[model samples]
Target: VELTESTRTIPLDEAGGTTTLTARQFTNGQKIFVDTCTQCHLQGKTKTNNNVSLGLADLAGAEPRRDNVLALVEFLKNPKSYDGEDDYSELHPNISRPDIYPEMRNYTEDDIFDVAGYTLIAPKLDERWGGTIYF
Candidate 1:
């Protein structure tokens, strides 16, 4: 589907809240992020507001409306149209961003949760990783 900002005709998904994940959940999420997200997003915290992919440096639950892990997982698979998450809505180029990025549909809902979990706990895990991605 040609998902776009216009496709997000639903209400804004901001102000939903943040999620808290466990250690295992965070590790799983990190693997998912490194595998799928790093291609375009790159490592480190969100340094610029121009890139589409959310930076993984210090992602402390800045996106997604659903704070709950299960709920967020469902939202990622077939996210309804929404302006954007309250935390990172204004950063978008236009008025508001879409709930689910169009390309993200390629991954499964469970995968999304893993990435979310990693991002949720990145503030802690990031400190443990050394500077390198096996390159």
Candidate 2:
């Protein structure tokens, strides 16, 4: 498929205010996310019962659980039963759906970040819920 994806470098807010992802990084991340995890990750960007989580939109909310960009990047590498794998510092305890939810380890470290990064800013790409965390 001759698919051309476009991305941008925008200021996205994290727990510590806002940070930026380079244009290339955003493009690559969004592409990677669509190609790899879109099946279970998003349903046409619509939030639904079957839609598993990357826990990005939650970061901007009042009761945000994990909005730390560095933490998300670190956790995406090795998400479960993580014992020093990928130099993980601590457990996120909230967003990481480990073991049961199929560890996303098939791709490179950069790839994980791409998925995580894109997922982090997916409120635009995907029609994410900016309302509540109970779902």
Candidate 3:
């Protein structure tokens, strides 16, 4: 589906009310996700780890609950394991560990927020998101 400014605004959380993304933020998120995360997280599926997908349930169930924009933004800056015990930078591309994934060095704070927003929104719009069972 084509998303514009009017359509891209989404509920931030069940209690957090809503968040409105600019057209630029949404588009940057769409492109960033495709270029950076699709290798392992195509449509929210974590190819390397079947136990965790980007689905809301899994995101919320995380050690620190990566279900919201702030949590996710922090995760991108410093990725941790599901248990939040280890540095997941080797396994996941993150802004903090640019040496592991040089491309992540290009992501600014706004860009990170945009991508995190996309991850949250995509699952809401598509039922098939965040799993390996579909295809």
TM-score per candidate, chains pooled: 0.40, 0.48, 0.85
The number of the candidate with the highest lDDT is 3
lDDT for model 3: 0.82
Query: Superposing every Cα of model 2 onto the true structure, what RMSD results?
Result: 7.8
The residue-by-residue lDDT of candidate 2 on 14-110, one tens digit each, is: 4345555665666787786666556645532324422224544434331223445555555554443212233222443222444534434345666
Worst 10 residues of 3 by lDDT: 5-14
What residue runs in model 1 are displaced by over 4 Å at the alpha carbon? 1-22, 44-75, 79-108, 125-135
- Candidate achieving the largest TM-score: 3
Question: Under the 3 Å rule for N, CA and C atoms, how many clashes does model 2 have?
Answer: 1
**Candidate 3 collision pairs:** none
The model with the greater lDDT, 1 or 2, is 2
Local accuracy by lDDT, each model: 0.42, 0.47, 0.82
lDDT of 1 at 120: 39
lDDT, candidate 1, 1-135, per-residue tens: 222332222222245544444455556767766765565445532333422223232221323444345534544443432334344333322112334444444555556666655543443334533122331
